[PDB]
Design a protein that fits this description.
The structure is a homodimer of 400-residue chains. Chain A starts with 8 loop residues before the first helix and ends with a helix. Chain A is 35% helix and 26% strand. Chain A is built from ten helices and 19 strands. In chain A, the strands form five sheets. Chain A has a six-stranded mixed beta sheet with strand order 1-2-6-3-7-17, sandwiched between helices. A four-stranded antiparallel beta sheet of chain A has the order 4-5-19-18, with no helix packed on it. A four-stranded antiparallel beta sheet of chain A has the order 11-13-9-14. In chain A, a hairpin with a 7-residue loop joins strand 18 and strand 19. At the A-B interface, helix 6, strand 11, strand 12 and strand 13 of A face helix 6, strand 11, strand 12 and strand 13 of B. Strand 11 of chain A pairs antiparallel with strand 11 of chain B, so a sheet runs across the interface. Bound molecules: zinc ion (28 copies). The site of one zinc ion (ZN) has 5 residues of chain A, from helix 4. Chains A, B: Keywords: Hydrolase, Metal-binding, Signal, Zinc. Chains A, B: InterPro entries: ArgE/DapE_CS, Bact_exopeptidase_dim_dom, Peptidase_M20, Peptidase_M20_dimer, Peptidase_M20A.
Chain lengths: 400, 400
């Protein structure tokens, strides 16, 4: 049984070290938070995190070609065998120039990205330190990762490299992402994203003299009209939107270039592919329809299909052992397990058939993805919450 | 017969002064061209033109409340009786900051706005001077006008004030506009313009979480689609266009404000009114359709109808004496009169039932409304062309 790892002497010893060095964990949250990591600019924080991973006594600490920082907690099994990966992303949503200095408010700490996801970075370091000092022996290797590109336009570039090209691509059989502070969350589902900018081009000309020629504005408008007739099931939740538009010079001219940006989301990879294929077909039919309705004698309407966002959809079945481990540990810790869909790093592992769950770092936090982000490092709740992820991790890797 | 004015000694004497002082006319083209008059910024050129109007010996030289500069060549009839107005607009299409210095190329002069319409301003000054010095007596008063707001967003604000609010609005029974250099043109028809920016507003929200709410992008798109199914007769030529669009923040959000700009033009005021009314109904129907298809629980879609352009349509019958005068004189000068529709200052007078024709200043010019604009002030062709407008003007006012 998974929750039995909570009654092992190794875990209880490791929790005492988390208790003893909780003051160190908070210092490392502040140190890493004040190293800003905007999207595609995580190199500075990755270097600092890499130093802290080897400071925790991990093996083979390195930074891969993508920018992820890794460390190995070697298990008792054969080298190169099945392993557990647990990651917390280095990047934040805040762009370069955002002033990040931690502000203390009694037991609260205010700083952009302090809970998403910098706290999880330090909680993983505390896991590695406490496990090694207490002499915990795991059956499978554990790869502690500070990955890049989880937020915004990063589009999971970090976990994609780890799981399709990196050293551990063939060894990760259980993937964890520690994202957020809610230690009762169990993200078992991944909401996918497909986003395009369609640029419609045409010959142009005078609105009066060249009237009758094809107008790319109409083909774009016709796209939106058919777009919002695509069936979207309530469950699995499937959504879409026409969100950004632009183009044209003046009312004196027929436009020669206009653009519309589209959003498509779904909990189901099958439903997301249905919408994407219908959207791409609607784009083609809308261009053909405009070239039939008006004159192409000066050149036809053309459409440039550019993908501007891609995140896979997926799910870990509730019967998978990794979910049963997370459910059992969270129950035994007195919390209510919250299985949910979301858009996290685990989306990548789910799309590859790898059992994956996204978990929380513990304690209290709020106002993520905003400048008012803050966490509560009150020891009783911050420590007890941080002990949850360790139990899930040790139950999954297996202890001896 | 109208062309008989060309054989009167007053006209023949006045033409010799135009010949003698053609070197002065060219200097005034250059001087006035280098005084930039962007739309709504004609005050500097209007002040200089007013000074040149009194230099020609005209009466009651003043600048009205709209900014037009006018002067009166008093006729032999009773004061306050029917009068002839001849105007050349001060403004050009080139915005403030456009470097305007005349560049000589033999007999060519290169400068933005030099032929449209600065040359016509100087040609009118030369008419008044040559008429006064040769002692020509006209039966009707002639109001020489340097009017404002003929190009772009001016929307005929100058002639609109002159003929609906100014001192002479009830005395002008024949209107001329000298616009362009083609002395064989006879603009007897006015193409009307109706232009709107429709701003669609909505509640907005997250594209995923708030999916199902109304989207103003869809109402706008549906408007454009039905817009291009409006019947547009080939003759009288009626056109429309969806030309400018914008709005939206990111693919993560349902837009809360988008806009589309529409163009509608016709040679017929009735056909233009049909399209405008059908357009306004399509806008409303599209808002009602979008508020029925999706949820208004956060607020409905609304549409702000803002007119951004208005120019009336009209026509001067070819049987009108003002057209017979222009046709006969242009023939007698060895040219083929080319009657045409266009969008000039005469649109206003046609709209008010005033006989109106737009004529040219003579000579050679090209590349109007562009930075490569130039004219050829080669005396033989520039003088003979400038004599055409004088003949039309004197035949219409009547000489004694
Ligand atoms: Zn015990
Ligand atoms: Zn301590
Ligand atoms: Zn300290
Ligand atoms: Zn260190
Ligand atoms: Zn890359
Ligand atoms: Zn930089
Ligand atoms: Zn985040
Ligand atoms: Zn995060
Ligand atoms: Zn044209
Ligand atoms: Zn505009
Ligand atoms: Zn062509
Ligand atoms: Zn994305
Ligand atoms: Zn559960
Ligand atoms: Zn429950
Ligand atoms: Zn409970
Ligand atoms: Zn000189
Ligand atoms: Zn002067
Ligand atoms: Zn005004
Ligand atoms: Zn200024
Ligand atoms: Zn003009
Ligand atoms: Zn013009
Ligand atoms: Zn939301
Ligand atoms: Zn026609
Ligand atoms: Zn965008
Ligand atoms: Zn509300
Ligand atoms: Zn206009
Ligand atoms: Zn107007
Ligand atoms: Zn007609």
């Amino acid at each position: 049984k998974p929750e039995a790892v909570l009654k092992t002497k190794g875990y209880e010893a490791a929790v005492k070290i988390l208790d003893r060095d909780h003051d160190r964990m908070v210092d490392e949250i502040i140190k890493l938070t004040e190293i800003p990591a905007p999207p595609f600019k995580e190199a500075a924080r990755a270097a600092a995190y890499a130093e802290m991973l080897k400071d925790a006594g991990l093996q083979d600490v390195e930074i891969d070609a993508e920018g992820n920082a890794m460390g190995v907690y070697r298990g008792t099994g054969p080298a190169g065998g099945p392993a557990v990966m647990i990651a917390a992303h280095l990047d934040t949503v805040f762009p370069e120039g955002t002033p990040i200095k931690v502000r203390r408010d009694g037991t609260k700490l205010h700083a952009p990205g302090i809970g998403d996801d910098t706290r999880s970075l330090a909680v993983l370091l505390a896991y590695a330190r406490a496990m090694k000092e207490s002499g915990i022996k795991v059956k499978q290797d554990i790869i502690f990762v500070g990955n890049v590109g989880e937020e915004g336009s990063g589009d999971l570039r970090g976990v994609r490299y780890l799981l399709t090209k990196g050293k551990y691509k063939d060894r990760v059989k259980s993937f964890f992402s520690m994202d957020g502070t809610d230690a009762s969350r169990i993200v078992t589902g991944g909401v996918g994203s497909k986003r395009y900018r369609i640029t419609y081009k045409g010959p142009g000309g005078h609105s009066y003299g060249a009237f009758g020629l094809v107008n790319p504005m109409v083909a774009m408008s016709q796209t939106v009209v058919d777009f919002y007739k695509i069936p979207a099931p309530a469950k699995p939740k499937t959504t879409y939107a026409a969100s950004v538009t632009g183009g044209g010079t003046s009312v004196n001219s027929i436009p020669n270039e206009v653009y519309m940006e589209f959003d498509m989301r779904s909990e189901s990879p099958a439903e997301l592919a249905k919408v994407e294929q219908a959207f791409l077909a609607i784009v083609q039919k809308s261009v053909e329809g405009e070239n039939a309705a008006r004159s192409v004698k000066e050149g036809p309407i053309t459409a440039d299909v550019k993908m501007i966002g891609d995140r896979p959809a997926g799910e870990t079945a509730a019967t998978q052992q990794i979910v049963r481990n997370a459910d059992a540990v969270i129950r035994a810790k007195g919390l209510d397990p919250r299985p949910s869909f979301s858009s996290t790093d685990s989306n990548m592992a789910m799309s590859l058939g790898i059992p994956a769950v996204t978990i929380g770092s513990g304690g209290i936090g709020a106002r993520a993805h905003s400048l008012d982000e803050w966490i509560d490092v009150k020891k009783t709740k911050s420590l007890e919450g941080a002990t949850v992820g360790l139990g899930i991790l040790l139950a999954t890797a297996g202890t001896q």
